[PDB]
Amino acid sequence: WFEVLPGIAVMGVCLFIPGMATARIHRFSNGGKEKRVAHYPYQWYLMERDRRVSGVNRSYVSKGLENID
């Protein structure tokens, strides 16, 4: 009832890695924000619009109200 807990504690950590890894790639590749999901073709139209007007070539930088004054 004792020695079986180290056997668990190597397997149990081994699924804490891929959940923490992928959650800190999308949040890290796009600068501290979640990743935009797009299930419907209308939802793609906002991102592909936003890429044309955000700053350079990205759907993950903002423009803001202060941009157009």
């Binding site: 979640e34 906002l46 423009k63 157009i68």
Partner: protein, 111 residues
Amino acid sequence: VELPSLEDLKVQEVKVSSSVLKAAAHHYGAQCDKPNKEFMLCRWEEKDPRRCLEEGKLVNQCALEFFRQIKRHCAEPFTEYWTCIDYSGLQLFRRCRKQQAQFDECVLDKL
């Protein structure tokens, strides 16, 4: 076919992002109602969007003044409102439901 010139283009384009456009977005359409609903008759009731270019600027020019009003009067709760809703994933409306009334504390009252 014949097309209009390079002029009657290049108007003052609203250069904002997706979430800040969807930020207010609800107060927006339900209170202008003269240039835009008539623009639908200019597109549905008669087709060929090459004739209908006046009211495409009537919806655009008034929308330029909609954000120009909200910048001068109350933009301190506005910028933090579309901050939290830009914390992304589907842009839900039940996450920032708490912080929605701090924006609308005065939109019903101030302006």
